[PDB]
Design a protein around this ligand. Structure first.
Ligand SMILES: CCOC(=O)c1c(C)c(C(=O)N2CCN(Cc3ccccc3)CC2)c(C)n1CC
Ligand SMILES: CCCCCCCCO[C@@H]1O[C@H](CO)[C@@H](O)[C@H](O)[C@H]1O
Ligand SMILES: CCCCCCCCO[C@@H]1O[C@H](CO)[C@@H](O)[C@H](O)[C@H]1O
Ligand SMILES: CCCCCCCCO[C@@H]1O[C@H](CO)[C@@H](O)[C@H](O)[C@H]1O
Length: 337
């Protein structure tokens, strides 16, 4: 049986939602987000109304990708769906899509505040990010924009990685993404984790570049200029030649950079923040690192089904994408709760 819907404007947008969801309150604005109370479960929830989901091919395509991705993500440390709804009663009237998930209420800046965290707390937060990333990476997905705003956290420090979130974003990006390499390893996400971890431990941004080149300079100053093995892996002649033209600079000792940190934390940052992405520690490897001894449970670090990215990278008409998104709404089964 179809739920009864009600409407109300919030910030120039009409939202029509099932009666289930009450006390809609804007928090941010791909789409706009209201906190809300789900009366059926007793849970506070975030409700996201997609923006103009089927007005162009590319909005339709994006809509389908987000819905399908979120339906497939079922893991404690990755954002997933509690509900998906449309007021529409048929394909012909299908114009709006709303996604529901657990309200976390905060992201990593909010909990953190630029103050340094205890080692135990840093351990717990990074452990959860890695646990989520193992899962994402097992599905052959690369996040590529891991940063503090893309990590939702509740007040008990429980964390979920977000597709898109609600402090420069460049600050956490892997060097190869700053230079537009088009082949990427999953360990681009591991670089981002090293950056976040450093910050949590020291209370300061690791690489706070004022712009792109300043950022690459700050990176090279910590990790050193590329060695002989790395230089051999550069396809672009102009890049190769530029890099060789640079004054060699040694890698810094991270003990001198992270004074007084847990030596296990220092050891793990050295394995995350290596310039050559082939040499960076993987999510699964990092989870087994001794830094996480109080949290690591090799029987509770689940892995995903491979994810068919080819279906969302098609070139289809709006009405095809719209109909496919419609079937995903209908086929949705809410999770055990
Ligand atoms: C003070 C800064 O406040 C915050 O950072 C903050 C965060 C991170 C959250 C939160 O829990 N999110 C972020 C947005 N997705 C939307 C969504 C994604 C997918 C499906 C459905 C909805 C849900 C998880 C909230 C409510 N806030 C308060 C605005
Ligand atoms: C919920 C966890 C899913 C994380 C991955 C989804 C984030 C989508 O953001 C990214 O879009 C980029 C283009 O902007 C692509 O290059 C990336 O591979 C893709 O992950
Ligand atoms: C300023 C020059 C230093 C930046 C070099 C970044 C090195 C990243 O490392 C490189 O990642 C590539 C992109 O995914 C991979 O193809 C290579 O195997 C790996 O060596
Ligand atoms: C491998 C990618 C090659 C990128 C070449 C970047 C060259 C930028 O060049 C540098 O940029 C800055 C000025 O904006 C200054 O810090 C330096 O003096 C300047 O030489």
């Amino acid at each position: 049986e179809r739920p009864t819907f009600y409407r109300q404007e919030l910030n120039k947008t009409i939202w029509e939602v099932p009666e289930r969801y009450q006390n809609l309150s804007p928090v941010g604005s791909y789409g706009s987000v209201c906190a809300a109370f789900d009366t059926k479960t007793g849970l506070r929830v975030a409700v996201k109304k997609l923006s103009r989901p089927f007005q162009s091919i590319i909005h339709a395509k994006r809509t389908y990708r987000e819905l399908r991705l979120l339906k497939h993500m079922k893991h404690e440390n990755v954002i997933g769906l509690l509900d998906v709804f449309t007021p529409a009663r048929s394909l012909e009237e299908f114009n709006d899509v709303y996604l529901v998930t657990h309200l976390m209420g905060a992201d990593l800046n909010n909990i953190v505040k630029s103050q340094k965290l205890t080692d135990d707390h840093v351990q717990f937060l990074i452990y959860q990010i890695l646990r989520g990333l193992k899962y994402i990476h097992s599905a052959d997905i690369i996040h590529r924009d891991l940063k503090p705003s893309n990590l939702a956290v509740n007040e008990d420090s429980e964390l979920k990685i977000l597709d898109f979130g609600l402090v420069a974003t460049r600050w956490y990006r892997a060097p190869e993404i700053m230079l537009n390499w088009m082949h990427y390893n999953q360990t681009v996400d591991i670089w981002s984790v090293g950056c976040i971890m450093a910050e949590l431990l020291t209370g300061r941004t690791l690489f706070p570049g004022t712009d792109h080149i300043d950022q690459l300079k700050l990176i090279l100053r910590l990790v050193g200029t590329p060695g002989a093995e790395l230089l051999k892996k550069i396809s672009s002649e102009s890049a190769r030649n530029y890099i060789q033209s640079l004054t060699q600079m040694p890698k810094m000792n991270f003990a001198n950079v992270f004074i007084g940190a847990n030596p296990l934390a220092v050891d793990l940052l050295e394995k995350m923040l290596v310039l050559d992405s082939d040499k960076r520690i993987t999510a699964a490897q990092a989870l087994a690192h001794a830094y996480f001894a109080q949290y690591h449970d090799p029987d509770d670090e689940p892995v995903a089904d491979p994810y068919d990215q080819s279906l969302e990278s098609r070139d289809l008409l709006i009405d095809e994408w719209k109909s496919l998104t419609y079937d995903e709404v209908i086929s949705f089964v809410p999770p055990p709760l």
